[PDB]
Subunit: 354 residues, 4 copies
């Protein structure tokens, strides 16, 4: 792989509804977003079946739950602008049409919830800088003007809240290194400058918070293995050294914090099957990768059910969506084998960043 | 103190709105619930001023945020039944009138959110058993019938979600020991029998979840000191031994999990000032109690702001509400001194359980 | 129990030889010290049988391994002075006679090894102060003069090295509180003043080091339950709050750090059987006490074998020594039932401090 | 670097005496072992000056403290056999002549102390297998016959005790991977088969025990960065995945467990200066490498003083020994700059394994 490669992404975006039912969003062969959902937040739930949103789109969709429980989806349109739609009531299948947010965008959109309940969206813009736009009142359709955060991006952005409520954004730069930028006061328009975390990454960055409030970042490296880095925490502005984990991976990674407070990462492996690794104790070392049966055609997208069971979605070789999950809440739970969520096929609509 | 004492309670119930603004609920000299709130989730926010809900009540009010962001308050009425009111839209001061849930209740109400978005309320009933009633659809005014969980209670109930989504309820029994009962499957009407955690407690029990998903319970003991116990976790049905902490306390305790993932407890001390103790490292031993200046006339009620700053409310010697808070997000932050939230005086409306 | 009670002590002192074989020292009905030992450091080792040291003694004996591997025993004599004897070669049954160290002593002796290889002995003296005497060259019979550390003691002293090589000594004071005093530079004659850790204790204090270098102290409290306190560590001069553990105990406690780095404490319980409690995770909460079958007539004395198996010695109702042990090295090992180390009976020679 | 490279080794072997004074052993331009030592275990100690052992040698020397405190040194002779010498009394400069242990050896010797006080030495033999010989009685000159443990080695062996007293040996195999072999019962002649830990390493392996009893292994990898792996512990036979740490290193690493229970590693860096990294919390992530001033000409050899201060020895550009150290016991201590231990120059006598 080249230093400038971006590993194969997830084929859906997933959210929990207000009632915690899982719901997935992908793009079909008609270049439209479709969605499907659990009918009940139970281990044996049926799924509703695929439902279409009319309108042609030109990126992967990003979904987030508002602070009033309503799901809202962001996508690039045929005009290269940002568009969004939403549930008009939490847990209900009454959606708005696609509505315009304008701008000129050149990445998939990334959405985060501020600590004061306002959604905020981050994209690469026409000048390759990071741009952003936000709700100006929590869970309301009153949006700011577009504003630039500068930089030169070569991946999609990834955003996460610090434990103190400050949004921090990670993105690969022109030197193929991981860069980041952050709010310097919680949920305020006061941002740092861009700083480098060095290294080279060959996927979009993925970020998660540990129990103790430290952000941890995962990405594929130049040698095609998973690597990770973390905030050293307490008063400090610093981060750890980077570490690689052995095992060649062939997609973006997806990270989750299990019921027990420990980190787990999923990725397509060198043999094109799903691999999983977990921290074996607190902060701990990481397990050898474990494989699930079956060749997969996207990165995993990982979610947690209402009862904390982990569930993983992928593109199959039939170009449909498949999933598997933990059968019980224990971190030692058994797993199911891949099952089909049939009715449509999906395409990878991700923006070709080059 | 007698084994059957119940330490002085908090004078308000507090919640975060959908936008994370703090809002408090107490009962004034007119025996009505009044509320007040931060106008913005900022460290220097003004407060709106006290607003009254018409109607005479006969318990402490309990508030919880619905899964759609709307606050909802529960209280006993003049008819000894349960009543409730709610924001009709998240973050807005448009409330319903008090509406009936019926029943016959003999404690303050305790409200919990299931892991599937449905509110559930626990009370002592006319027969001294634990009773419960719940939303049958998330964030909707469709409520179940009343149902009994048996037992014989001598404190108010305290409810908390396990990390796997099962509600567990703690209450003092007829032998003055801590008892508990739990959902055996997440957000389902399938409950355990009552089991004893032994000991004797002389306050309502207070419960919190640690980072690693273990519940921990705090209460005042027979010797008037704080004591605590925790789930041993992983696969186990067991709990730890009890431990006491030195230092005589003179109110119910209030527990909070700080930004760093560590536990802190607040309580009125032997000298009638606010005391605080914290875990000095992970799981760790506990700090000696630290005091804040000023005599206080209730237990503390503790909350966290949108940026993780801890804030504490108490009844003053003037019978008004006072508060203090961390000036910044660090666990080493300085604290303010008590400041008045003036405009009304409060009474302790707690149900006299004897 | 009275605040000034001192719980029943262990009936033997135990050490590991240079080869790690266990060896025990007690006083028989002839008021002489006798000893016995494992013939091999193996789980099924035979014991040599009881061997007598000629000479009448008037305290419990204290043993320590020199920095050259030779065991050395300290005891009060018929003249109320300190006496000592030693192996003349490591792992060999060629002992010196009792030889004089003089002084006037009014407690059992306590021996510690400095971090520079010199033995040091702490006693209560004729004026009730703490006194000490030491080897002036490692593992040599060149001893200092006696020197006073002041104070007013009401228990035997207990000494332990800090992780940085400074000896620290714990003893109950005239107010029945735990006091302590320490070297302010490693293995140097530069000591702090006495400081109080407050509380009241009703046993000799017992001290151990945790993995992370923090000392932890265990003692029975005024309410006859185990209590404990620890250094908060890093740069700090401070200690934690005290915690009690439920369960009435009826002897001194004995603490051990298992193979896994976790603390375990043993004590005679309220029913006069051996009880055990362990930290269930790192720093963690403590397990409920677990009992072994059989009424015992002393506190436990606890040791670890060459392979880390824990072994516990007690006085039986026949007035002989009994022991039990872990059958394998795991912290989940099964335990044997009490077995007799027959051939003599023992008396409790502890100095009656009142 | 090639997969079969073995990074530059330490220029001395170091031990603590019975009194904890540091003492170093190297080979000079006369192909003889010389040694030097602290005269007192103090932060400002003078060093005695270089003293020669007569006799020409043909490997790096290995030293270990016996269970009776006497230092003992192992080296290959001009006849390719193993030879050894020892202090005839702990802490004294009265040494034996070199005495024969015979055999045919083709690596540097590695010495370990069993948990029953017997020294054991591991070498590569004439057939490239691992061979061993041991004291048959603790701290005695009664040695076993030579015995083979098989395998095919391409590095020097590294031995360490498990927490349960079982010796485990690590060595690079014919495939350049890390292999290991272990006692299956403590201090017994009952060994496992060889098993692979996979990976490729380009230095001798270095092993240390964590607080919690898990062995951790450090080595340079194929990409010239530090990598490490650990036992997953409790009941398990398994190890973690390998992790690399960023930063190109140019010598063997040296690992130490500080006062606080945390791991630190030292290595010559890409700029030929001494680099250091530490675990920033428990098990934690690792700090970015920190550099000390000055170009160095060997790997570091790391030791701890009687008071826990870390001290590091290296070969200078003048071909003499230099050292630096922590000025106080805190893990935040300042460090000195390199100072000369003058009087001789040293050569790297390591056996050329190819
Ligand atoms: C998502 C939107 O879909 C339709 O609504 C188009 O008219 C827009 O340009 C956009 O593609
Ligand atoms: C998202 C942003 O869209 C508009 O406001 C442009 O002027 C910017 O360059 C950026 O493309
Ligand atoms: C991910 C799925 O894996 C197996 O179940 C295959 O049979 C499917 O086509 C799909 O690739
Ligand atoms: C809270 C309610 O307040 C009024 O609405 C009364 O009519 C009810 O009995 C109840 O007290
Ligand atoms: C809350 C409950 O109220 C009614 O349904 C009563 O019949 C019960 O006894 C209990 O008091
Ligand atoms: C809690 C407050 O503490 C001090 O500030 C007093 O002056 C007030 O009356 C009040 O008791
Ligand atoms: C331990 C010693 O035993 C004998 O050697 C006596 O003569 C001494 O006074 C002392 O009791
Ligand atoms: C151990 C000490 O013995 C002597 O040196 C006495 O003068 C002291 O009072 C103390 O008793
Ligand atoms: C400690 C031992 O416990 C039981 O085994 C009794 O039969 C013995 O007499 C002794 O008390
Ligand atoms: C270390 C030994 O040194 C001398 O004693 C030689 O005679 C031996 O062959 C060996 O080299
Ligand atoms: C150390 C060993 O030395 C002898 O006993 C040889 O026969 C072996 O091959 C090995 O070299
Ligand atoms: C390790 C030492 O580093 C510097 O102090 C140089 O001046 C020396 O020659 C030596 O290389």
């Amino acid at each position: 792989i080249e230093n400038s490669a971006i590993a194969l992404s997830g084929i859906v975006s997933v959210a929990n509804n207000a009632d915690n039912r899982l719901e997935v969003f992908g793009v079909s062969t008609d270049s439209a977003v479709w969605h499907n959902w659990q009918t009940a937040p139970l281990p044996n739930s049926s799924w509703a079946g695929w439902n279409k949103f009319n309108g042609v789109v030109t990126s992967k969709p990003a979904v987030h739950r508002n602070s009033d429980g309503r799901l809202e989806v962001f996508v690039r349109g045929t005009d290269n602008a940002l568009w969004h739609n939403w549930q008009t009531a939490a847990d209900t299948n009454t959606w708005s049409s696609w509505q315009p947010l304008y701008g000129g965008i050149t990445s998939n959109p990334e959405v985060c919830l501020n600590s004061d309940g306002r959604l905020e969206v981050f994209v690469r813009g026409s000048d390759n800088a990071l741009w952003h736009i936000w709700q100006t009142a929590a869970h309301t359709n009153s949006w700011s003007n577009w504003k630039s955060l500068g930089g030169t991006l070569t991946s999609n952005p990834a955003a996460h809240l610090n434990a103190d409520g400050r949004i921090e954004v990670f993105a690969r730069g022109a030197d193929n290194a991981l860069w980041h930028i952050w709010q310097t006061a919680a949920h305020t328009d006061q941002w740092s400058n861009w700083q480098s975390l060095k290294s080279v990454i060959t996927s979009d960055p993925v970020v998660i918070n540990n129990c103790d409030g430290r952000l941890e970042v995962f990405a594929r490296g130049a040698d095609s293995t998973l690597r990770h880095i973390s905030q050293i925490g307490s008063d400090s502005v610093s981060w750890s050294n980077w570490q690689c984990l052995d095992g060649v991976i062939t997609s973006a990674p997806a990270a989750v914090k299990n019921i027990s407070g420990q980190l787990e990462v999923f990725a397509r492996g060198a043999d094109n099957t799903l691999w999983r690794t977990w921290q074996t104790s607190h902060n701990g070392p990481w397990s050898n990768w474990s494989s699930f049966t079956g060749i997969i055609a996207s990165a995993p997208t990982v979610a947690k059910n209402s009862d904390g069971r982990i569930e993983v979605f992928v593109l199959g070789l039939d170009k449909a969506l498949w999933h598997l999950w933990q059968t019980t809440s224990s971190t030692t739970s058994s797993w199911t084998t891949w099952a089909l969520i049939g009715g449509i096929t999906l395409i990878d609509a991700s923006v070709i960043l080059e």
